[PDB]
Design a protein around this nucleic acid. Sequence first.
RNA 1: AACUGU
RNA 2: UCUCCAGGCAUACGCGUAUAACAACUCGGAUAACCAUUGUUAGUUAAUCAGAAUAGGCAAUAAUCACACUAUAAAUCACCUAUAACUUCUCUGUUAACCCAACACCGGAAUGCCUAAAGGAAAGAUCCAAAAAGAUAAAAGGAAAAGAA
RNA 3: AACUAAUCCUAGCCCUAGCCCUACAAAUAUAAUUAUACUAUUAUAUAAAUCAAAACAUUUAUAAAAGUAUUGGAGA
Lengths: 387, 328, 96, 172, 97, 176
Amino acid sequence: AYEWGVRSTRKRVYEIPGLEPITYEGKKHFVPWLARPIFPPWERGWNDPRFHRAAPIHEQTLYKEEPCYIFHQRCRLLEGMKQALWLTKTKLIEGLPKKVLSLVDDPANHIENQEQRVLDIISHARLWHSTEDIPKRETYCPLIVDSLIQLCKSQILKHPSLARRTSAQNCTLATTWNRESLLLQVRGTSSTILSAKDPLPVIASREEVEATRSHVLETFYPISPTIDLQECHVYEVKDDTGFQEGYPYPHPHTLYFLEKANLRPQRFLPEQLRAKMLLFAFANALAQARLLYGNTAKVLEQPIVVQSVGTDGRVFQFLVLQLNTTDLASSEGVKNLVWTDSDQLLYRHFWCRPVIKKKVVVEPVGPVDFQPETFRKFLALYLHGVV
Amino acid sequence: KYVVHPQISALNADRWYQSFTKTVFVSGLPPAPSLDLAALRAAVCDCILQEQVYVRRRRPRSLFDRRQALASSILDQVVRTLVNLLAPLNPVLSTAALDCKRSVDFYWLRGEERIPAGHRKGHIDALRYQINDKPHNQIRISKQLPEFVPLDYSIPTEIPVMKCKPDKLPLFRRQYENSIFTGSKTADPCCYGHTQFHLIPDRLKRERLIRQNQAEQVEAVFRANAIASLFAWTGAQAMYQGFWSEADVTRPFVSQAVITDGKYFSFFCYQLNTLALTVQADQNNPRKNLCWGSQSQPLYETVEDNDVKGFDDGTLLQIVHFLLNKPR
Amino acid sequence: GIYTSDRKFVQIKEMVPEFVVPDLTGFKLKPYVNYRAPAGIDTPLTAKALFQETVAPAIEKDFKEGTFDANNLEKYGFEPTQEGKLFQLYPKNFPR
Amino acid sequence: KFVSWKSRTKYTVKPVKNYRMIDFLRFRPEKEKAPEPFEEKVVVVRYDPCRSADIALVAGGSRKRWIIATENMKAGDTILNSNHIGRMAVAAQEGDAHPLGALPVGTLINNVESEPGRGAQYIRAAGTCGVLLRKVNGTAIIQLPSKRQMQVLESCTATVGRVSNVNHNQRV
Amino acid sequence: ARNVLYPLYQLGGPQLRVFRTNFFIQLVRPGTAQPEDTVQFRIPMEMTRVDLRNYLEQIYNVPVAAVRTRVQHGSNRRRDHKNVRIKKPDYKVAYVQ
Amino acid sequence: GLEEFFDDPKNWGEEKVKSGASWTCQQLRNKSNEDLHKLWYVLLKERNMLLTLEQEAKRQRLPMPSPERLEKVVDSMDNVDKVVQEREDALRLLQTGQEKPRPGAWRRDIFGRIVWHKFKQWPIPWYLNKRYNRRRFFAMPYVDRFIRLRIEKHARIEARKRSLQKKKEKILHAKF
RNA sequence: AACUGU
RNA sequence: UCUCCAGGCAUACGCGUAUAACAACUCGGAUAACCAUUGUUAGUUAAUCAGAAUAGGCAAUAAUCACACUAUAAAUCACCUAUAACUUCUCUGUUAACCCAACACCGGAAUGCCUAAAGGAAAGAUCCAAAAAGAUAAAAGGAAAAGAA
RNA sequence: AACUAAUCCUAGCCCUAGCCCUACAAAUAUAAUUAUACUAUUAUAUAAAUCAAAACAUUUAUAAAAGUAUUGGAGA
């Protein structure tokens, strides 16, 4: 039976006026035969954090009646891609930018023994790195990406211009903007941000930027755009690019986000990762525009281009975002342009120990169905803007 | 078996480690393409020293790891950039493998003891030692480094001798798996290495040690970590080649490591000549292991505003000089 | 010290005793005394003796002069409260 | 000193160390909706360790909640929860929660509540079905598994269809 | 000081000062073989190793580098003429370098 | 100093060490408060040296020369403590009138006996301290039977004592 | 049936 | 040194000085030697081994080398938003041939590693009684080998 | 005249009389004896039966008048 009310609870002398009942307060200890004293509130003389209690939200000075919705890593959008596009006022073009694809077409871009080196790195990242027989994704997933970046970073010999960019750690990105009168905030942190001294080349011309006015953001009535976001009544308006002002590499080249959870239920779905990347990538791009052009709302004459790569060590997702407007109050008008490449598999499966069936080595200790094309797509993004 | 900590606060721990390792520690460095040293004075990335003021990150909850966390971030970034910057000059760096906070293990036997009591009283047992280290960074290459001195090189200096038992100095024995590791499995092609990087904790830093009255032990901490880390790391490499106690190495194994307290930087070079350290295997062995170390030197003075003042190129030159070295 | 969260010991400097060591240079008192020195008959000090030695002369002179009042009881040595002193007579808050 | 084991602070559909928190108030207005009829999807028909009948996960809007499964609930089915008393007969899909006024006489029902807002307390066992014996204006007769026929207001919520394991009463 | 009550400390409270010390220690020839700098001491079981460090540094002006301490269990096997177990007083051995 | 832990090298090997009488209480009272604190450490230093020598003698299975020295030092130290305590006690009584340094009161245990309860300092008050309230300072009703037994036991003790004296008296008459 | 110190 | 046997080492639990050295030869070992006995003295060393703040917001998708792949017994705090605190290494465990069974009881006694490099000794001496017990061998023969029902 | 053993007097008690009684430190009811917060804190219905009535059932004691009268399976 459904219970209304906690189931746990389910199965004279003082009145005299002008006189005070005697109580064991004088005794300084409880005795059943004496009346319970009336105790005024106790004062410790100092504040104990262990016994301290946080004040209620409404009493906070920063409390605001309007709700600020904050998006963080754990947030999972119910509508996935559709909600992200509406919130970020961006127009989606399938596939990577035409320029990015052409980067790896150049023979010089291709690394010498690129597939073999990736295969060796994959084997090292999965097996040789540690003494454990079967290392888990929590360990090799950070390692494989770092090793791949070093291999890509080794291309500075071919292209000295690559020396103008560096990667930072635990960069925090945050912005606040309004969509159709709805207050939206995106908070992103962790991972790494590749930054270069020069902005990434604009993918779409000003004429193309104006053409985005025709595009209309898709709606999903009656579910509100603020679904799955953290509703906040105590908040502060902030814009963060991951670095304080004065950074010599103000332009972020790529925004990485790694999902190293070993278990699939513990791992965000591919759609959710891209949705998280879109908001986080949009926030970083928006912060750059706000710093450069101030807090005014207007269509950006010079679009800002930023990239994001999300991988779990086996599946790789590549995202490129171009910020075309800062006038995000309206849902119609110039829209940001985003290029999406999803479900790029480095390898279908990897065996960390030899698989012997009927005294036959069916599977070696190496990646299964390894696809060097995925690394090429990753290589294209890294080299983009330099070659 | 005895558990050996590469970083330990025991007095004369380097001397005790040398006795267990049969290593002689000679003070100073081992006997012996322009790149704009001034460009590397800044290409070494004072930018990460600039980024520690710019790169925003969630504040540590402890409030004590803030200082230590900062040192790790700068060192990792500096190592990454330096490898890329020095790659064109030295092709070895291109083929090298970089290891971050990975474990190096070595298991060796030196000496013997008589059981004093118990059901096995009087029985003879060897003294077992295990060294487990996790260098902040180390570089693994597929080719052996050039020797700094020919094998069988002899010097008048004598290895330390310990009067008391190992247990008298704080040390405890435990029974667990014996492991010899080079930082990666034998399948990894890079069975050799270029350099090893170590970071001293705050507890062992100069300021606390001086307050604790163990100012003289600052160099000992540097030496103990260097000798333990390099010997264990070098010994594993030789075993990967098939050389063991009864089959001593036919070629000297050499390695170098750098230990920093966060400001000061020290350089150490180790050469492994003997794998026969057991009483039986070392019964008649004239060869001995040799280690060369240098005093810790500041790499800079302070970092105010958004730049670094007082950077010392000399320490960087040793890193540059070390990195440029390649086998002949 | 105090053990904080995470099972981590946090030594408290205030709770760590500091040994106050007297200066023995120029001090003529030693562990033993002469057999030449006569033994001392025990005369334990009492509140009456302490009051008589120090407080009585002040009040006696003041009372004859007439300059005696309740407000000036502290002048003769009364302490209204033990707070403010490092060593509090009652409740005893100081170690030997 | 007794604290019930059903002490989870937050209602969740994930198994709890497993036990899944069931919801017996079928018409609880979900988030981002007015107190008006709303629809839900039967995500999965799972097994409930603590109840004889199997529980079907019913999901609508932004809220996911476990509910008791009727005879023919399967994955992907559509479940409607209405408070409005239909002027005409309301479309009846097995497992839907509608006021007894909307339903016509003779429809098998389960998870009925004696009083409006009480929540499902009867016909929650396997093979138990309540017959709507009579319907007059705002009053209806609901036969509970105890064989007690009771008269309740049309506002009371009743779920159409018999409970899962239709042959529970026929077990031999 | 032993067998005495120590003042309870609260935030902002005074530093603890022991003007008179009841701790008494004895220097003992090491039973085992120890380094020459290492010294064995028998100290009251209520004394901490930090207390010994301050004790030697302040009272005797002795510089101390490292301290290792052990608690020796007193054998209770001994019995009297009435067959009543006699317990040896437990003592703490401190190895001070 | 390390030498202070040991006896004079000249005295080593001597049958005894010449030492005088211990400090008497009156002489310590004559000494100043600062002098008393200084003297305490001086006595303690000698006591530790004598204790240090004695322990080595136990290890060597040898007698301690002039063991009376330790007794004299201990007697002097004991005299010092009471003299200092006397001055502290007198002033506490004058300023506060309390006969005990620690707050306390008479309380009844669960056995019905009346015992002096020494108060403990807490950061919280008694009414907010459930554990202190959990401590029982009340006597159960069944203790009335025990109270009668205690009175009877006291009478029984006197009766048994008389019997013990009687047996002793028998020999007195027999002997005399 | 064989087998065997039954 | 030789001959031969083949569960050994750590932790848990329990035990609580049975540990080690010296000195004893009375008592304990169901006999000696020697100690496990008697007396006395000594012992086990840890920043790494082990033990000893608060209020809100929000969570669909097991594992099995987890990829494919199915299945049924249905199989996992985090992170955000605020509040509070602000510089730390003391205390305790560490010996042993050891415990539960009245006993130095042919019994009972968890886990990890390994299988001899670890760990051990069936012979107090003599005699070769009968009778009895166990083991081994059987000429011819086979109920006076492992096959069928 | 020998062995094993034996030898002893106070160790103390018993009943009345008399008499009511008002006899270190440190740690502790938390896990008693754990130097500071946890977790609120709490005994007890006729006394019965056994037993006697040779079992068992109502029932069965706990100054003189006087073991008179009554009561009682009129019986203990």
